[PDB]
Design an enzyme around this catalytic site. Structure first.
Site, mmCIF file in Angstrom:
data_model
loop_
_atom_site.group_PDB
_atom_site.id
_atom_site.type_symbol
_atom_site.label_atom_id
_atom_site.label_comp_id
_atom_site.label_asym_id
_atom_site.label_seq_id
_atom_site.Cartn_x
_atom_site.Cartn_y
_atom_site.Cartn_z
ATOM 1 N N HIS A 42 0.797 -1.241 0.000
ATOM 2 C CA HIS A 42 0.000 0.000 0.000
ATOM 3 C C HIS A 42 0.829 1.292 0.000
ATOM 4 O O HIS A 42 0.322 2.347 -0.361
ATOM 5 C CB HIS A 42 -1.073 0.010 1.107
ATOM 6 C CG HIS A 42 -0.553 0.331 2.475
ATOM 7 N ND1 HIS A 42 -0.264 -0.642 3.410
ATOM 8 C CD2 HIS A 42 -0.302 1.517 3.078
ATOM 9 C CE1 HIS A 42 0.158 -0.069 4.523
ATOM 10 N NE2 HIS A 42 0.144 1.241 4.349
ATOM 11 N N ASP A 91 -6.533 -3.388 -2.803
ATOM 12 C CA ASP A 91 -6.535 -2.034 -2.233
ATOM 13 C C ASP A 91 -7.824 -1.674 -1.487
ATOM 14 O O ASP A 91 -7.944 -0.578 -0.936
ATOM 15 C CB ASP A 91 -6.189 -0.981 -3.302
ATOM 16 C CG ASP A 91 -7.275 -0.814 -4.370
ATOM 17 O OD1 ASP A 91 -8.435 -1.251 -4.172
ATOM 18 O OD2 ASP A 91 -6.962 -0.221 -5.424
ATOM 19 N N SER A 191 3.886 1.892 8.633
ATOM 20 C CA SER A 191 3.640 0.927 7.548
ATOM 21 C C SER A 191 4.907 0.430 6.882
ATOM 22 O O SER A 191 5.826 1.213 6.620
ATOM 23 C CB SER A 191 2.768 1.539 6.458
ATOM 24 O OG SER A 191 1.401 1.376 6.757
ATOM 25 N N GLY A 192 4.942 -0.867 6.597
ATOM 26 C CA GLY A 192 6.037 -1.445 5.832
ATOM 27 C C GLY A 192 7.206 -1.890 6.684
ATOM 28 O O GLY A 192 8.079 -2.620 6.213
#
Ligand code: GSH
Lengths: 241, 62
Positions: A42, A91, A191-192
């Protein structure tokens, strides 16, 4: 990270910061070999007339401690060569939220720059186990990011419990890690990034990827992370790692 | 339409990226920064301050 503390310098040498052009830090990532990082899909989706999927738009900072000291000794700046979003990434549901990032130029291993270990497909991070989330993300939801890398200790939650807290939203690709109390959790800007799990000889393995949540650190809304084991082969196939 | 692009309140969403964005605040007729998660935002979400100002120029609560 909400409810965490300052990390010690080079305590998480696999934690990477990803900056998009003229936008600063967007997402975390983890170092897995001299050439590859793991992150969340994302983070790299084209939006509002910017090509987040275009590898040329990003800068990775490896061995970073403080966002205000990006030129400190041992911090390594790296451009990206390619971005591989998982083919099945959704998504709308956030299913298959994982990406691979190829460094343009190999990372130089040091005491501040070191890869995290990857778990085999059959390895289970057992419910109840304490693991770490790290990042420069917000220390409160709707708040502001941290300059110093944050760490927070959270616990693996049973899938059935996770499903029930967030009905119709959790897939086998996802794992609830946190507390039913809230208080400690990842947040926007995280995130990530990798979940870090201390294993049997003290070596740290990646348990997951920061993905999503219903606000941050709220009661009965723990963080949702992309599991790593089921992506071991996909990782190997695409990177050789 | 300006309803969505200018009158809607800002939506961070559930994803945990930190995308610096701009929304229009129609109470003050001014574009302000917020941090978007990366997922399922609404239309009052702009990359640049000037894009926000432009899209929402002359807009008031009805
Ligand atoms: N000695 C090896 C390094 C091996 C290494 O850095 N192992 C990593 C990846 S499995 C590791 O144990 N990182 C996690 C940790 O230090 O806890 C080399 O010369 O490259």
């Amino acid at each position: 990270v909400v409810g965490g503390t300052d990390a010690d310098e080079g305590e998480w040498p696999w934690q990477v910061s990803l900056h998009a052009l003229g936008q600063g830090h967007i997402c975390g990532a983890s170092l897995i070999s001299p050439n590859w990082l793991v992150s969340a899909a994302h983070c790299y989706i084209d939006d509002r007339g910017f090509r987040y999927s275009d590898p040329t738009q990003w800068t990775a900072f490896l061995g970073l401690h403080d966002q205000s000291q990006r030129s400190a000794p041992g911090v390594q700046e790296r451009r990206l060569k390619r971005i591989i979003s998982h083919p099945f990434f959704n998504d709308f549901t956030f299913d298959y939220d994982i990406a691979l990032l190829e460094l343009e130029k190999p990372a130089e291993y040091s005491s501040m720059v070191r890869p995290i270990c990857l778990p085999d497909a059959s390895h289970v991070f057992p419910a109840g186990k304490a693991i770490w989330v790290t990042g420069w993300g917000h220390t409160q939801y709707g708040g502001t990011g941290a300059l110093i890398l944050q760490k927070g200790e959270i616990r693996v939650i049973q899938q059935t419990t996770c499903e029930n807290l967030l009905p119709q939203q959790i897939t086998p690709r996802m794992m609830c890690v946190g507390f039913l109390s809230g208080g400690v959790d990842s947040c926007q800007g995280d995130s990530g990034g990798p979940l870090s799990s201390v294993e049997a000889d003290g070596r740290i393995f990646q348990a997951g990827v920061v993905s999503w949540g219903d606000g941050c650190a709220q009661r009965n809304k723990p963080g949702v992370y992309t599991r790593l084991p089921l992506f071991r082969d996909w990782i190997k196939e695409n990177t050789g790692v | 339409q300006t309803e969505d692009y200018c009158l809607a309140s800002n939506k961070v969403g559930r994803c945990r990226g930190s995308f610096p964005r701009w929304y229009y605040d129609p109470t003050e007729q001014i574009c302000k920064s917020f941090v978007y998660g990366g997922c399922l935002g609404n239309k009052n979400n702009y990359l640049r301050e000037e894009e926000c100002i432009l899209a929402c120029r002359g807009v008031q609560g009805p």
